[PDB]
């Protein structure tokens, strides 16, 4: 079983996270230090400078030649069992949509791994399980936050064609997009225009206004609009230059010099402190914590803490994990939900209230849940 000293090692690593979150909730709600426009310049700094340098500090120290390949395939099998049962729902049931296929994939299979997940598992099980959580942060930034970006851009590019070309879209040859437009999700006026050719062909051009198609064409429109959203993103330069350095530093034994290693480490020490500070400012700016009713909030904390760790119990036993590697895999599935699935769903308006409960009301009850599996597994 566990000893009473282990309960002090968990509290040593997690009570310093809630202290920086209540000081930011109290300084807006209670004692009123920050104006809501002054409070918007702190979240703008954490999102651009502090956290994309916290993820460089972890990925550049990863050793990609000695990853744990059996643990890392039980994490990539969770997100195929889940993503295939939702495919047998919107293709076989009659009321299945794509607004719910994105939301039920973000709730059940994408937790908060970088800010909360690495200090929590390192205190529960030791310094080897903090080396396994970095291997999961690599696979979310580079695969599962890119597949989810292909779904929001396919959801938006089929609305713009199915609304404006209801009876004609079978004859579209090619679709261009002017470079003024970066997201075609209704925020800009988005005038469209067609070139009628000599034999029933059609050249669609999406423009900026001022006061089904074939799959050889739809897959071309999406890759243009994904590349424009992928180079304006700070987490795609933290993972491009994080992985590229760790492939070189761990083969020829190059150690990064102390001018450059301290120039990065002066801002990334503000990573884990300011991220939890920026997360308590956000739960002070919403009107209520439970912002989606009491039915849709129990639904957000039953996909997250039950259907999560009951589909990595059958995807970790069907691979060959036992002992401690089974216990680390179940506990990291019960982490609260990450923030980047909320950043996407606030922009595209795909249920922004169900994914703002589960980030805020996830964090407040995450600590007596993960300490409830840690007692029950250890028995």
């Amino acid at each position, epitope marked *: 079983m566990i000893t009473a000293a282990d309960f002090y090692h968990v509290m040593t690593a997690m009570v310093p996270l809630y202290v920086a979150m209540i000081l930011a909730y109290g300084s807006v709600k209670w004692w009123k230090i920050f104006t809501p426009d002054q409070c918007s310049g702190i979240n703008r700094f954490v999102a651009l400078f502090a956290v994309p340098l916290l993820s460089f500090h972890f990925i550049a120290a990863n050793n990609p030649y000695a990853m744990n390949l059996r643990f890392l395939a039980a994490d990539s099998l969770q997100k195929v069992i889940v993503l295939s049962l939702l495919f047998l729902w919107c293709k076989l049931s009659r009321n299945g949509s794509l607004d719910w296929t994105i939301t039920l994939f973000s709730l059940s299979t994408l937790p908060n791994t970088l800010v909360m997940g690495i200090p929590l598992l390192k205190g529960m099980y030791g310094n080897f399980s903090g080396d396994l959580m970095v291997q999961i942060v690599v696979l979310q930034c580079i695969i599962w936050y890119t597949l989810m970006l292909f779904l929001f851009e396919y959801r938006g590019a089929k609305l713009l064609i199915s609304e404006q070309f209801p009876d004609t879209a079978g004859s579209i040859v090619s679709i261009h997009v002017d470079s003024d437009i970066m997201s075609l999700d209704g925020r800009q006026p988005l005038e469209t225009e067609a*070139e009628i050719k000599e034999d*029933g062909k*059609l050249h669609v051009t999406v423009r900026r206004s001022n006061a089904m198609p074939p799959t050889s064409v739809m897959t071309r429109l999406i890759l243009i609009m994904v590349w424009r959203k992928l180079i304006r993103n700070p987490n795609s330069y933290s993972s491009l230059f994080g992985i590229t350095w760790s492939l070189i530093s761990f083969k020829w034994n190059i150690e990064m010099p102390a001018l450059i290693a301290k120039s990065i480490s002066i801002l990334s020490d503000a990573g884990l402190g300011m991220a939890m500070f920026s997360l308590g400012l956000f739960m002070a700016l919403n009107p209520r914590i439970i912002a989606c009713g009491n039915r849709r909030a129990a639904f957000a904390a039953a996909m997250r803490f039950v259907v999560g760790p009951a589909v990595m119990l059958v995807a970790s036993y069907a691979v060959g994990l036992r002992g401690v590697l089974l216990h680390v895999a179940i506990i990291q599935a019960a982490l609260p939900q990450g923030i980047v699935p909320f950043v996407f769903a606030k922009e595209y308006n795909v249920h922004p209230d169900i994914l703002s409960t589960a980030v805020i009301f996830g964090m407040l009850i995450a600590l007596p849940i993960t300490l409830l599996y840690y007692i029950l597994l250890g028995l």
Partner: nanobody, 115 residues
Framework: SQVQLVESGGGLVQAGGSLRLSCAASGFPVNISWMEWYRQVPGKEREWVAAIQSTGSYTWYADSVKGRFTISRDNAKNTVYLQMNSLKPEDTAVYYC????????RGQGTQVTVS
């Protein structure tokens, strides 16, 4: 549905002539009267001319073309005619119609050039 536009009326004329352009629409669903006409020089920054919009009450003309270009609606033949009067020599560019059925459809076939 094999949609197709038919444009005509293009020709070479002097300064002070009279032309009668054409835009014959066919092969459509239920159309709304929002057809247009504009210019496209070999340079950039094109300029819009006229409108034959919903009720025929107000027509969005430009500044220099107000009170001199007659636009006309014919919903029977589904063809909007743009009658030009006192044709200024700066009309060498291409003119074409922009019928709107929710998304603007247009062609390219004219011969408008004023000498």
């Amino acid at each position: 549905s094999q949609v197709q536009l038919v444009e005509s009326g293009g020709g070479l004329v002097q300064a002070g002539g009279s032309l009668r352009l054409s835009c014959a629409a066919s092969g459509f669903p239920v159309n709304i009267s929002w057809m247009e006409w504009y210019r496209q020089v070999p340079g950039k920054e094109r300029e819009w001319v006229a409108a034959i919009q919903s009720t025929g009450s107000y027509t969005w003309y430009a500044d220099s073309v107000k009170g001199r270009f007659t636009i006309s609606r014919d919903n029977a033949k589904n063809t909007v005619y743009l009658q030009m009067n006192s044709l200024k020599p700066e009309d060498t560019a291409v003119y074409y119609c922009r019928v709107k059925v929710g998304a603007y459809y247009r062609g390219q076939g004219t011969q408008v050039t004023v000498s």
